[PDB]
Every structure is written in C-alpha cells, then in structure tokens.
Amino acid sequence: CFTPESTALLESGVRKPLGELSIGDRVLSMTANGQAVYSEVILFMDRNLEQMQNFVQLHTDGGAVLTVTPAHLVSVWQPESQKLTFVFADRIEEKNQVLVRDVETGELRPQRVVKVGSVRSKGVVAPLTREGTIVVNSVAASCYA
Amino acid sequence: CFTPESTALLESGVRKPLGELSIGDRVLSMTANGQAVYSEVILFMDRNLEQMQNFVQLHTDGGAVLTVTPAHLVSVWQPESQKLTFVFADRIEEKNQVLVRDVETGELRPQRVVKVGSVRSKGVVAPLTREGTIVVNSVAASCYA
C-alpha cells in the first residue's frame, strides 16, 4: 500500500491523492516493458484512511520520494543487464535504480535511489489498475503488495 | 488462487500444472485490451499444495473449466458494450461471457459460461506474471485474488 497523501497522475494531466482516487480514474501506469501508459483503476485492494502503518521511503536522485509498505513490489532497473525486475520495497537499497517519470518527456527513466528511510503514518491505499502497475509520486511500482 | 492441477500454457507450447510452475516460466497471459501474450511468472502470491480450499468452477460453452477461489478476479466480456471487465469468480453467473483461448488461432475469444459449480480440494496456487493476468485452463483471469 501507499499513503492517502501519495499521488497518482491522471491522464488529464493532474496529480490526485490516492485517498481521493476513484475507480474508473485513468492513472499513469507502466507496461511490462517499462513504458508509461494510462490505465483505469478497477478497484482498491486496501483502502483504510485511518489504519496506522509502517512505510519505506525511497528517495531518488531527482527528488522523488515514494512512500510504500515493506511488502509492496517496486520496479528496479538493472543498468548493466538492461533488466527490469520487481523487488519488495524493504529489500531496496541505495544505489539500486527505480523508474521515475521525466517531466519534459513524460517517459519513465531510471534514477538512483539516494536514500532509504522509514515513517509510520495513518491510512493505507492500494489501487489496482488494469495494467497491474501504477506510478505513484512519479515512481513506477507494481499494484501488488 | 487456482488448484495445483490447474494448467498454464507455456510460450513453448506446453501446458504446465500450476503446482509445477516455476518463477521465470513465460505463461500465456492477457493484455489490458484482452489480447493473448506471453509473460513471465515473477512470483507466487500463494502456493500451498496441501491447503484445503473452496473453489468456484466456471464451465464454458467450448468445454473449458476454470477452477478458481471465490475472491479471484476473472475477465468478463460484455458483448453489447464491447467492454472487458473484471468480476470476482463468485459473482459470475451463467450467460456471462469469459475469454477462452481458441485452439486454431490462439486468440482469446469470448465464450458463454454454461454452468457454475463448486468443489473443495487441496492445494492453492496464485502465480503473478509481469502482465498481471494469466490464462488458466484456457480461460483468461487476473492474477489478483
């Protein structure tokens, strides 16, 4: 899950807090080969805006910060082998690379994780899109947790 | 989840029991717009070959039978509105339509659900592919349950 304050990017061009996200909204997602694409939210696998939860915080070199639960799958780019893989949030470390949306081009491009933090906050939201992936706070991730 | 005896279709052209499925295997899946495509199994969300479980059994007009847990998402085709939607297995009824792989063409084509049964067996397997979907026993389904 992500936090209610975490944001998705609607096809319309607007960021929307996950706590305000609605089934049907077409949010920025990622294809199997790592490309940006818009997909509709079909349901929420978890949505409790009061539930206290522990979150991993991934900071990218570009300034993006993704707050996700320990067991949530996140896309990790292996620069050497040109391999896109999914790793649990808690297993991600500095120097690993994640896909972050580039403002100018709109493309999902790899960025170094420069800091791995933690935080405990209230509210959990886990949206499921048709694609099965979702870009939260500009960082690509799986919908699975 | 599906049963261990349920089968996936490997890109190689061979059916493989889910209980024998391995991470890395490229199984027949479905794209967001309902097309057949091969995707690799990245992990199992559930895999307990001993766990007794209640399953819904969907029979198609073509003879395919998909055994899935009540809370598993399955693709349902709405012929009138040309809409592909996901519905929980237990909410599916006769006359609804699901996507079934055609032998000759290999395409995922809609077929009427001619009978909805039930069964309790041992073993649960829930494979997750990169696409997020998987065709089990020739019937298209989401990986989510």
CATH number at residue B107: 2.170.16.10
Q: Distance between CA atoms of A43 and B102, rounded to whole angstroms?
A: 29
Q: How many domains in chain A?
A: 1
- Which chain A residues contact residue B72 at CB under 8 A? none
Alpha-carbon distance B127 to nearest alpha carbon in chain A (angstroms): 12
Tokens standing for residue B107: 């395409």
Q: Distance between CA atoms of B84 and B74, rounded to whole angstroms?
A: 10
CB burial string A25-35: b at 16+ within 10 A, e below: bbbbbbbbebe
User: What sign has the CA pseudo-torsion B72, B73, B75, B77?
Assistant: positive
Q: Do A86 and B42 touch (CB under 8 A)?
A: yes
Please state, as a whole number, how many other Cβ atoms lie within 10 Å of the Cβ of residue A23.
11
Please state, as a whole number, how many other Cβ atoms lie within 10 Å of the Cβ of residue B104.
5
> Which H helix or E strand runs over B51?
strand B36-60
- Which chain A residues contact residue B32 at CB under 8 A? 39, 130-131
Alpha-carbon distance A132 to nearest alpha carbon in chain B (angstroms): 5
Please state, as a whole number, how many other Cβ atoms lie within 10 Å of the Cβ of residue B32.
18
A38 near B CB under 8 A: no
Q: Distance between CA atoms of A39 and B20, rounded to whole angstroms?
A: 32
Strands (DSSP E) contained in chain A are 7-9, 15-17, 26-30, 36-60, 65-68, 73-78, 83-88, 97-101, 108-129, 133-136, 139-142
Burial class of residue B67 (count of CB atoms within 10 Å of its CB; 0-12, 13-18, 19+): buried
| Resolution for this experimental structure (Å) | 1.9
The whole domain housing B25 covers 1-145
A139 near B CB under 8 A: no
Q: Do A130 and B42 touch (CB under 8 A)?
A: no
Contact residues for B78 (Cβ-Cβ < 8 A; gap 6+): B84, B85, B97
